[model samples]
Target: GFVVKDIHFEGLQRVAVGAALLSMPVRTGDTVNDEDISNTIRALFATGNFEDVRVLRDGDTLLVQVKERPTIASITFSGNKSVKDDMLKQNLEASGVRVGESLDRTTIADIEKGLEDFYYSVGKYSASVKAVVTPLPRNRVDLKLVFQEGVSAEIQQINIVGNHAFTTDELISHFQLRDEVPWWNVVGDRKYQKQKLAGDLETLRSYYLDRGYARFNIDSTQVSLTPDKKGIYVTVNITEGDQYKLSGVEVSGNLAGHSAEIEQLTKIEPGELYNGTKVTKMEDDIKKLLGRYGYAYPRVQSMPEINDADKTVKLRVNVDAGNRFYV
Candidate 1:
């Protein structure tokens, strides 16, 4: 085991030293596993408290340093006709920069990116947006977002590629796209949002697997902007695989005086189609049942053994009925 020998801070502006350090999982004299240090920095980043966080080592001496992000004292909007000030504020809030909240540089950058998205979704290709930050009293800061609403642009074309299994319309509906338009309508062919796109890919993967494409893989999904920056296109590459079936189910554990009761709840049914969702639900039920009987630390794990030769899968659930404790 290693230990944290020293700590240092630099490039800090508005965040309190105590608040920044509070998120750290390891401290001086604590064991310094590589994972602990990595997790500590990740936890701090999750709080949106820093622009940059790093853990440096000098001959066993770990130096935890960070650059604090600006704090938003207030947000002011100007020159917004189609969208209201409160609406803009609400959008920025979702970007993780709210009034009286620490403003991570990345979050602020995301807010700027979101402004471009908001404009494009409204069909305004020539719109311009600018953001400014000002310092305020008591370690606070202010944000000003100004927009120049310009003429709207029309969708030139919509295209999809590398989808041999699903129809183009089927995947397009997953995203909010438009075929017809109305004046003053803000909903147009919006570009892919990273968060929403990730979810969409997951949905597509699940759709394929549920339809007997077990080894389906999404190679990549790309949203490209036209050279003129007025239109966009989406492309998805996929690899589909053969479907599989369930061959057997097995359960093993020290049943802790409730073996008979738990056996009734075990969901391993021979000859039933393999379903990951049902298997997870069954594991959850087993744990809940054990908790009712005071086996609070029960460990349950499900392992699926697949026989490629037969294109079948067998699920084995192993449970550890640890020492029972009172509530």
Candidate 2:
């Protein structure tokens, strides 16, 4: 054990000696042991401004050595087409990995991973992102994010199985993703995007559900990419159950003392074929109707009770008119 008679900071670059000494736990005239020396090193490391820190003893004199982390000088990107450089720079800035900031080695891996993921989301299967660091003079680094955005996989074929009521052309017409485009259609895009496929599946389900197929279901979906990674194939399996007719429409739930008027808002006719679009419109109409009556956030739902054997559905419109506001 030795009492610190004088404190000296060595290897100080870019950081003032006063700032470095302020971070130390041991000061002049303080009795310091091995544990105190280790604690002083730990405290300096917590400041995030230093890459390496060392504490030494010189006959009751404490010598604190520190190597400051390099500051970022410039950040540049190349070989990016789908994502603009401005957008990448904006995202990097949000993550605190921008120009003129202290470069964090841990976040560089995340930046590469996130950029590569962005490329993959837009069908660029062979895209690669690498962060290269070029050390400059005066303890600064030049960050270069290199991107190799590969070709997007085109939709080679799209097949729908188990659709009987409607032809394939009719169903495919409603989808945003297309397999092929005519030569005259210059603006058509047949690229395979994961989000577009998910949206098209929802559209397919909605098309059947709105056309009286109460038990319409998409059984499975398969998306395959070619070995060359430039072509894609999509197949969707669906089950279109029997068409259902609306047996009756019943209105239930609290109507905020205007039951008759709220019931009138439901204009569904009995014996008509079940139409999900019309039923959903009726729900929206009821919500709007309640909104006019000072009920701002009302909940209205049209529940269908289906009879599989009879192929008939009973419509139940439930309403919960929430609190009413005066203004």
Candidate 3:
């Protein structure tokens, strides 16, 4: 054990004398060891009041020297539209560092991850967010947050699975994202986008339903990148039920006002193949024709009636032409 005659701190401007004294491990005429000095240094850093802490001993008298962290005079940004300045600022507020707040250069390193993650969450990858320290006019340093919003990933492959009813080529033929280049990829063509995949999934589900696979269900889909980081891949798992045939169809809307006029406009015919594609378009045309008299909210529901005896589906267009609350 080593004996300390006195212990005092040096180079403190904003930190109070009492705070520093409380953080010190040894006091006047106190006994200490090498381990005590190490613990005391750690304690001082935990207080977040110093950039550097040093302990010196001159024959029993201990001297504690510290360098306070500089205040961040300002924060600036330079990058793309994927992550705006305010977005980063909002996230940075969670940390204890802000403009005009004193934090050492190492403080910048702590919050770089939070900024980089923000861009990734917004469907943008390969972006870099780095915060650097810059000297300022006063006893301060500015935190310059520099970031680069990288380009979108290329689509390497689109894997399809679990479709015993149809071929892989037939199932995803309608999807816009393709691993191979399009014949007309001249200027603007197929590119992987979160929104684009979402829309294509809707179209895909409907395509199966229109082809008499009414019980088709998409199991799961994931957009993942390749090992080399060259391109992305979208994998979709689906379940297809048995094929169905159109048993019959009827137009039961409040066709009360104009039944005969709308019948000729009804393209959803009966006693034929139950096509999912045609059914969707038939409703649109029916609504278009009704719009001539200013119809509001066309309710065209394809009510399915199971014919287990024949393995067929009878569809009824239960249309509700809600009236235009009078002129």
Model 3, 118-231: lDDT tens digits are: 665664556778678777766677777887665656666777787777788776787775544545443232333554677778877887887787777888896788675567
Model 2 Cα lDDT, one tens digit per residue, 122-221: 5577688998999899889998899877776677888999998999869889777665444544332333345567888888988888889988888888
Give each model's clash number: 1, 0, 2
Checking candidate 2 for backbone clashes, the offending pairs are none
Best by lDDT: 2
TM-score against native, each model? 0.43, 0.63, 0.71
What local lDDT does model 2 show for residue 30? Answer: 78
Superposed by TM-score, candidate 2 places the C-alpha of residue 122 at a distance from the truth, in angstroms, of: 5.1
Q: In model 1, what lDDT does residue 20 have? A: 64
Could you say which candidate leads in TM-score?
A: 3
Model 3, TM vs. native: 0.71
Candidate 1's residue-wise lDDT over 1-327, tens digit each?
A: 466456565645655667767767877678878888789778877876667888777777767677666667778888777776776787777765678767655556667668867776666766787877887675567888888776654444545566776786686667533433446343333333434456666777766665655566777766566677665465677776666687766668876777677767864446566665676677778887887888788898988776779887777788777678755
Residue 183, candidate 3: alpha-carbon lDDT? 53
Candidates 2 and 3 compared by lDDT, better number: 2
Off by over 4 Å in 2: 5-10, 118-126, 154-176, 179-212, 218-239, 245-305, 313-327
Better of 1 and 3 by lDDT: 3
